[PDB]
Amino acid sequence: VIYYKIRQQLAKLGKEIEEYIHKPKYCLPFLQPGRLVKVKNEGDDFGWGVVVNFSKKSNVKPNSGELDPLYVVEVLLRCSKESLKNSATEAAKPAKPDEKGEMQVVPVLVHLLSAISSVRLYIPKDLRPVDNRQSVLKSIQEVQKRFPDGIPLLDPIDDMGIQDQGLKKVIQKVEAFEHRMYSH
Amino acid sequence: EESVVIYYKIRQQLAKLGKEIEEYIHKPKYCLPFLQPGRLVKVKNEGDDFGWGVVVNFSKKSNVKPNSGELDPLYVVEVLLRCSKESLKNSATEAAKPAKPDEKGEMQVVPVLVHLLSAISSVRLYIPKDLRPVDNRQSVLKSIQEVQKRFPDGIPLLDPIDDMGIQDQGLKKVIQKVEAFEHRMYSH
Amino acid sequence: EQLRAENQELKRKLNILTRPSGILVNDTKLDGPILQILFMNNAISKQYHQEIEEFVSNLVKRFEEQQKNDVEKTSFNLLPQPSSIVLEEDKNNKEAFSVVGSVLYFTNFCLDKLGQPLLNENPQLSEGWEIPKYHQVFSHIVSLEGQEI
Amino acid sequence: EQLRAENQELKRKLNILTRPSGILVNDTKLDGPILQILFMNNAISKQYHQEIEEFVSNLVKRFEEQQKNDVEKTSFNLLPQPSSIVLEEDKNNKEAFSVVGSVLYFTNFCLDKLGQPLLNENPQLSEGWEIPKYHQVFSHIVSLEGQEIQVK
């Protein structure tokens, strides 16, 4: 199938571009308190979220040779009422089609951020109450109508200052696959 | 001996072309938004150089009771210059004779014509709240003299081609001719 | 290659101006960017950084406490001659950003450019231009020849 | 030679950035610029062109009156994005006249694209960052597949 090859190549070049947008370097200066990013777990789509108070790694991994360099970045997602019901269950749930729940701070892993956009919302102090934390949500759904073509992302070529070679190779490969897609 | 003659000729040509472009840079179309207080303009009405001074105000005040009629509007710019003591002691004859390098002089607001600004700079010294008491004038002197201790090559004044936004046909020919005479001079 | 060394580079600099895409705006001259601060490496600009954003927030807030007045332009304040931001494609909206100034602060002077917008004449009826107070002790304006006051 | 043509119409648009001429910056913690503002058109908030200047003028005198409670500390910082403003002037040019952060303010949005520089990748001791307050009882993260990490 022409489209099967097309799809496969497209999504391989897709998977290639990341792991450079979220790293211990070229990323942590961007994770501002108010930056807008994405979160993509296996089979889970939370939506949009606002980074808040990313914290230094609490290394506990017995990797026996590595330095356990995973970072815990905290974002403000609307995961689930069902998931805030039980605090002891170490798991989150994506946004159900049901009642829209409440906003809470989820310390997701850096390797989960699919995209790191440029739109940076203003964050209010005193994010302890439940009502003002909804003021963020109504602001998010604001920007999504200001840009009806999707929120602009941060291409690492010109905007993040990525100077490596492999990412350039993958960019060339995806451009080639795109120009090949014209002949469907 | 003809080499020095040709050098003087090309120098006079360069000078006349400079005056011809200066007659375009200070025309009151593109230079009026550039007359904020503090632009460090220069004034030389062919007799003497006043120096560097900060702009205080400007206006389009026209000629009241026009002698022999009036068909072109003039502009008057109040700029804070350094005049001499003897000139202020009368302050009625011509409002002229700036201070000499043998006197420290004192600064005062002087009204000047629009066609006398021979250089517009791109620096804005800060001005005290209400000025007046001629001792903050001394602070203005200290600031304008300390600024001179940062650009020994020469203050960057402006660039008529991009900064102003001149898009009139003909300036390209004169800029080509000035660049040409500049090259010819720097060579011989 | 050799020539594309700087061209590929300066794209960063000529994209830091920014124009992400076609943005839907309705309130022309009240729905759009206010400033664009370019922070520089200096102990002053990296200790009071949150104070800058607090100042800008208080400014945008205090602008919203005025009504029942016509004070917005009041003079048909047409544009000075700008250098517009590049139109990046990733039609309409011809009134777009068209930056109208830029200043560097060195704590004892100001390196201005592009001047400042103002109507045809009378530079006392426009936003800005706080003229100091002078005495005007002279009564005879200088001139080339003739046309004396 | 499309690039030779391109390398001339770019530096034109780059006029806004100035780097005026050879300056003599005998210091790097008090000399050099502070910040460059690009006042936008069609903005009724341009009538405050004087209060902003008064603020940026009182800022240096407040930094002077708050010089320090003298303590020995390097307080150094690096640059996330090294894109320094161009220089058409035919001494220091790296630790000064270098954009560290550039934002495009909106009525409620922002367009930050360079971020504040960090010290040892730790936002907990930097000079500019400030973290809000929150409860944070959400024991144990949800990692990916079999990668449960005992954070605590």
Residue numbers in the entry:
A (entry chain D): 624 to 807
B (entry chain B): 620 to 807
C (entry chain A): 61 to 150, 160 to 218
D (entry chain C): 61 to 150, 160 to 221
Verbatim from the authors:
Three-dimensional classification followed by 3D refinement and density modification (Terwilliger et al., 2020) led to a reconstruction at a nominal resolution of 4.0 Å, but with a map quality sufficient to trace the ZCCHC8 globular module de novo. This module is formed by the interaction of two ZCCHC8 protomers (referred to as ZCCHC8A and ZCCHC8B), involving their respective dimerization segments (residues 78–198). The dimerization segments of ZCCHC8 intertwine to form a central six-stranded β-sheet characterized by domain swapping: the first β-strands are exchanged between the two ZCCHC8 protomers, resulting in a β3A-β2A-β1B-β1A-β2B-β3B topology of secondary structure elements. Beneath the β-sheet, two α helices from the ZCCHC8 protomers (α2A and α2B), positioned below the corresponding β-strands (β1A and β1B), pack against each other in an antiparallel fashion with conserved hydrophobic interactions (Phe115 and Leu119). Above the β-sheet, the helices at the N terminus of the dimerization segments of the two protomers (α1A and α1B) protrude to form a parallel coiled-coil oriented in a roughly perpendicular fashion with respect to the ZCCHC8 dimerization module. A major interaction is centered at the canonical arch-interacting motif (AIM) of ZCCHC8A (residues 178–184), consistent with biochemical mapping experiments (Lingaraju et al., 2019a). The ZCCHC8 AIM is indeed embedded in strand β3 of the dimerization module and, as such, it appears to be pre-configured in the β-strand conformation with which canonical AIMs are known to recognize the MTR4 KOW domain (Falk et al., 2017b). At the C terminus of the ZCCHC8A AIM, the polypeptide chain makes a 90° bend (residues 185–199). This region is stabilized by a striking array of intramolecular proline-aromatic interactions (Pro142-Pro140-Pro186-Trp198-Pro192), resulting in a “bulge” that contacts a hydrophobic patch on KOWA (MTR4A Pro652, Leu651, and Phe677).
